C-alpha cells in the first residue's frame, strides 16, 4: 500500500476526552502509518495535521517544506488535549476558510480526513452543513472516520449525503484503525489523479 499521486491530504484529529491519552497515541500512530504509505512531497502528496477541540491547533501545514521523516516526527508528538468538546464544525470552518482559502494546486485532489470520536453541542453545529457545502464547492472531499461509540453519526451521515465521494468509515474503536488503514489509504489514493 503506497500512494504516489497528486493529493493534498488534511488530517483532522478529535482532541476531546472521548479518546483517552493512550487511545489518542493510537490515533497519532495511525496518522504516522498513513504518512508512511503516501509519497509525501510538495510534488506528490502534501499533508496537514490539525488537532481540534473548541478551537484547533495546526501542527503541519500543506506548504511546510520539511523532510517526510520530520513531518512524521511532528505528528508523533502532537499534544493530547482531552477537551470536553471537539467542534467538527469549527475545524471544517478552519479547513474551508484558512487551509483552502486559496486553491494552490488545482492539479491535486483535496481531502479532509475527519477523525471523529465525539459529538459537539448542537449550537456549535448551526453552520455545519454550510461548511460542508462550502468545501464541496472548492472540491475538497470530506472523509469522515467515526471512532468509538460517541462519534457523531448524524454528522457522518450528513457528510456522506452532501457529495457522492464523501464516503464514511465507521470504526468501533481506535484499535480498528490499524486494520482498516490500507483500505482507507487505497480509497483516498483513488480519488487523486496520477502525475503526468
Amino acid at each position, epitope marked *: 500500500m503506497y500512494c504516489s499521486r497528486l493529493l493534498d491530504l488534511v488530517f483532522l484529529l478529535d482532541g476531546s476526552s472521548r479518546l483517552s491519552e493512550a487511545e489518542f497515541e493510537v490515533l497519532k500512530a495511525f496518522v504516522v502509518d498513513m504518512m508512511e504509505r503516501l509519497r509525501v512531497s510538495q510534488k506528490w502528496v502534501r499533508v496537514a495535521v490539525v488537532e481540534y477541540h473548541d478551537g484547533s491547533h495546526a501542527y503541519i501545514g500543506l506548504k511546510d517544506r520539511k523532510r517526510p521523516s520530520e513531518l512524521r516526527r511532528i505528528a508523533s508528538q502532537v499534544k493530547y488535549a482531552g477537551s470536553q468538546v471537539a467542534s467538527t464544525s469549527e475545524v471544517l470552518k478552519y479547513t474551508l476558510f484558512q487551509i483552502f482559502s486559496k486553491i494552490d494546486r488545482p492539479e491535486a485532489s483535496r481531502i479532509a480526513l475527519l477523525l471523529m470520536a465525539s459529538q459537539e453541542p448542537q*449550537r456549535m453545529s448551526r453552520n455545519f*452543513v454550510r461548511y460542508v457545502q462550502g468545501l464541496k464547492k472548492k472540491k475538497v472531499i470530506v472523509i469522515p472516520v467515526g471512532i468509538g461509540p460517541h462519534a457523531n453519526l448524524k454528522q457522518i451521515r450528513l457528510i456522506e449525503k452532501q457529495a457522492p465521494e464523501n464516503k464514511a468509515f465507521v470504526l468501533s474503536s481506535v484499535d480498528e484503525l490499524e486494520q482498516q488503514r490500507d483500505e482507507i489509504v487505497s480509497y483516498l489514493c483513488d480519488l487523486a489523479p496520477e502525475a503526468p
Partner: antibody
Amino acid sequence: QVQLKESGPGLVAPSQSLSITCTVSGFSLTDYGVDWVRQPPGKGLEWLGMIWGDGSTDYNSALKSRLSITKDNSKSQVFLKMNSLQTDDTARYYCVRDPADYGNYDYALDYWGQGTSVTVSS
Amino acid sequence: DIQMTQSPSSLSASLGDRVTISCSASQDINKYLNWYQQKPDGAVKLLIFYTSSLHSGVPSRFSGSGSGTDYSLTISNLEPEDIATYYCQQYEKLPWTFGGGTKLEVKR
C-alpha cells in the same frame, strides 16, 4: 396542535430580574428549539436568543450577557431569566418554537406564543 | 448584525388588490429570509420560510420571492383578514434580525 404560552410577572422594578415561564404542548422540547422575541410598545421585533433540543443556547449579544434560557424537558417548560432590567426592556415578550434542524439549516420561528407584557418601572 | 430594511412602513390598498411588500438586506443573505404576519390584535404567525415556502395553513394567495439582498412578499388578492403588519427576517447570520415592518391600511 403546537402551542406555547408565557407566564410572566407583569411588572419589574428597574435593576431587578425578569423571569418568564413558557409552557408548551403538541411537541417535545427534546426535538425542537424554543426562542424568545420581544417587542417594545409601538416598535418592531427583536430576536433575543434560543435553546436547542440538547439544552445548548444562542444569545443575542445586544443583551450584554444578561440573558439565561434553561428548560425542563419533562415538564414541557422553558425558562427565560434576564438580569437587571431597565426601562428600555419594557416590551411584550414571546416564546416561539423553531425546528432547530441544522441538517436542513431550518430555524424558522414557526409557532408563536401570544406573548406577555412586561413593564419596567418604579 | 445584518440590517433589514422595509422601505414602506405604511402601505395603502383596496380589498381585491394585488399587494407587494418589499424587504432588503444590507448584504447577500442567500435566500435565508422568512416573512411573518402580525395582526392588529397582536397575534404573530409565520407565513413564508426560506424565501418562498408556504407554512402550514397559509393560503396560496401569499407567495414570496427574491435572492441576494432583495425579497418580496406578494398577496395576489387582498382579503379583509390580511390587514396586518408584515415583517421580513434574515437567518444568514446570528443574531437573527427583522425588517421594521409594513402595515397595510384600507383605502377609502
